[PDB]
Design a binder for this molecule. Sequence first.
Ligand code: MN
Ligand code: MN
Ligand code: ZN
Ligand code: ZN
Lengths: 201, 201
Amino acid sequence: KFELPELPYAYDALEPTIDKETMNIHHTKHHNTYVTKLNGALEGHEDLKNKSLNDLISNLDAVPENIRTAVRNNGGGHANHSLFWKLMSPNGGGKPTGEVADKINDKYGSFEKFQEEFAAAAAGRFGSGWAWLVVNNGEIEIMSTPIQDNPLMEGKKPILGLDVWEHAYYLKYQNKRPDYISAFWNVVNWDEVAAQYSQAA
Amino acid sequence: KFELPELPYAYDALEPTIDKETMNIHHTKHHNTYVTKLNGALEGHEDLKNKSLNDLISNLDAVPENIRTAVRNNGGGHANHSLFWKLMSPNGGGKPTGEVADKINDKYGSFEKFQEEFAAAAAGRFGSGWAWLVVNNGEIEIMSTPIQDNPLMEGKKPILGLDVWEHAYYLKYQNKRPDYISAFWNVVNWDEVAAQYSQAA
Ligand SMILES: [Mn+2]
Ligand SMILES: [Mn+2]
Ligand SMILES: [Zn+2]
Ligand SMILES: [Zn+2]
């Protein structure tokens, strides 16, 4: 029921920023694994096996203790990475657009301002985890979920996130995470962020 | 007061198993950073600045909330990695020796038995973290501390640990952690484990 999604672009379609090589691994390895561990946990747990990844991820209570964690770590990863793949593009980057843009300025004053905040957050997260641009009600803040936890698990709808696990950049940038973070901006598809905004609200 | 320690061996003195390259980074980058962040936190906090890394790490309460975390994440890392560097050797590996050996058999029956347990633990830890072979009283168990937390922070004296952060192997093994884990065994210096055992007890 849960399947590994197709990359809307080539694996080298981002080769300057993120090396096609990690793209290959991070996609056909890690991610896939999550989709695997996931499907094979809900195996036999009927009522669960009938829920959307989102619902499933949201109400982490309906899942029995015995496998709650696995649906978490694997349910989140599969969800997080799923989103990630779409928040980049060979024909993307630049500055935000749409209401998302405005809101961003209403927020931290200027986009560059926001960025400086985000970059800081993405670098804040110790160990593994992700950084995001939630949308709590008519508002949007900046947070960072550890390991694979997804913000939807706290009632906050994501619209932008950045894998910060060292496996998402250690090949090309090793320990220089800020560099990886700076680079990110070039590929980020604000069109998606936009769409992901209207739906949430 | 706190300084980055010298590697008792060359950076390529483990080149078949762990690539000299990561050895260089993991040592002169990551680790160093921790020693940096550490010294620069206790800066000004007098009574603290007079404690041994161990004491300091142990009683994580005496540290004010405002910097407790930093002494943690950085205090643990600096301690963990410090130990790690010594738990390997170009002239090491093989099977355990000394009372440590016996105890190991008393424990899981056989060393290979223990290994199978350890390897499992090292692979268990989700996200970042380390796996260890604690020594609680006259006994020794197997656990895994997340991120940089160190078992000494729970009253358990370490004698063996394995960096499991993806930065300790992603260069040579990428996502194949079990392989990295298997490989580990070859370099592990049981002589050290031994010594580290007598002292604890
Ligand atoms: Mn990832
Ligand atoms: Mn490390
Ligand atoms: Zn069930
Ligand atoms: Zn003080």
